[PDB]
């Protein structure tokens, strides 16, 4: 983040998360194709490694910009269809509201106002409410979030986050429902290498969990990622854009200490 | 030993270091007077090469009920030093101190915030200096005896990173192997092994990027009796080092040392030390 606008609470510490999460894709062979990116068509076909289950997905996205609207369609192989309507920066400079639906309810309305040093958020779920608030002060970041159930009239979760970040170095911490502590350090050495460190421990248990990850970019269109943790789990991640259109991702998981591993492959056609 | 908590970054490879550093004290005659709640530790040392004399008066008193520790430092030259330490009050593994000192020499203060835990050992340093404030972080992880540590010093005056140090090592009480890289151009390794209760061994390794030559050292500590021990060290720079320490009675220990320039007639050094404990 190089702007004066703080990210959303859910997007807090995304840089370190991208080092651990993205670039791997274990235990799934998925084939995705997005086109006409404008009417945005997106096809997704993922096959499972453990259960050998093949599930498909076809996504359409009508987006026309001047009035700030974006329609969304997503139907999967086993019928479950949802629509998403979102207007951006029309009723106010930093206003944004969405509308959700599903098919066999799960309708949702999500409102969020962003400004310089401030990024509030509120979500209406159909019957719970989730409110979020993130404040930025000279590179620092503080955040709070509360999920409220309307029927029980009781707060479900309460997360409080503090952190400091730049485009080169990020540190974030958060407490989930009071009993869960989590921390993540992200530091990029150069344009070609990225490295993140993860920390988490639950209140009431003395033990903790830590993990390290890497993201090494050899060529502009070929990079490598590797992660590990104290649970004797290893993860390798490879990616090579074969040509501008198609982009291949091969990865593997190794169980350091029965003896079942995981292997992942991914192709990303783009026309 | 092999406690669940990893050590401080600066404390990585302390078992090997102690075989070299402690038990010697060359070229200095020192007299320490430790006294027990509060603690008044009086120190008086005289240099052998320049015949200068310094005497330090230290006052410390801890408060176990609230984890507080007060510490005062003052020497012959009018230099004052103060330190306050709180432990395990705001959190279980939390610890944070505040140092303050000035010398009629410069004046500076710093706050050192460090959180140790099972398998973790976090530590941060907020240092306010005359030149510029300096922020120094340190994280050390432990996985089944393996230790991986990192440390950075950040000169905040104008955004720059002063030193970056990456260190890995496998540590058990019977065998401690450690390696570190400093500033990306300096490498250093230590091999600590204790043969038995009576003998300890350490090996030192060091070489700099851009120079073919290396520097190594071998040390040893042999403890003849419960009240007497012997030390020895030698490096590839032709420097022999001996030391003898004997507890004469419960409250006193005597330390004799000598540094002998092995090859090329150079100035030799001799050390003597007393440690009254009362
Ligand atoms: C923190 C480093 C984790 C390394 C784990 C790799 C798995 C191999 C470990 C074999 C002993 C359990
Ligand atoms: C770096 C953050 C350190 C915060 C300490 C949290 C305390 C964890 C709970 C342990 C029992 C009090
Ligand atoms: C020029 C920006 C005007 C901002 C008004 C929007 C207020 C949203 C209140 C939550
Ligand atoms: C663990 C302490 C976190 C403080 C980070 C220091 C960043 C300030 C640089 C201006
Ligand atoms: C964990 C942060 C250590 C301080 C480094 C600050 C660099 C801006
Ligand atoms: C525009 C078609 C909407 C279908 C959603 C039920
Ligand atoms: C500053 C918020 C931390 C809460 C600890 C229970
Ligand atoms: C507890 C964090 C201290 C860092 C001061 C900037
Ligand atoms: C704590 C050492 C691992 C951090 C990435 C170099």
Swiss-Prot record, chain B:
GO molecular function (one): transmembrane transporter binding
Its membrane topology: Multi-pass membrane protein
PTM-bearing positions, type Phosphothreonine: 21
Catalytic reactions of this protein: chloride(in) = chloride(out); K(+)(in) = K(+)(out); ATP(in) = ATP(out); Ca(2+)(in) = Ca(2+)(out)
N-acetylalanine modified-residue sites: 4
Impact noted for substituting residue 52 to R: PRKN-dependent polybiquitination is decreased, whereas PRKN-dependent monoubiquitination, mitochondrial calcium uptake and apoptosis are unaffected
Binding positions for ATP per the UniProt entry: 14, 22
Keywords: Acetylation, Apoptosis, ATP-binding, Cell membrane, Host-virus interaction, Ion transport, Isopeptide bond, Lipid transport, Lipid-binding, Membrane, Mitochondrion, Mitochondrion outer membrane, NAD, Nucleotide-binding, Phosphoprotein, Porin, Transmembrane, Transmembrane beta strand, Transport, Ubl conjugation
Modulation of this protein's activity: Inhibited by nitric oxide.
N6-succinyllysine modified-residue sites: 22
Protein name: Non-selective voltage-gated ion channel VDAC1
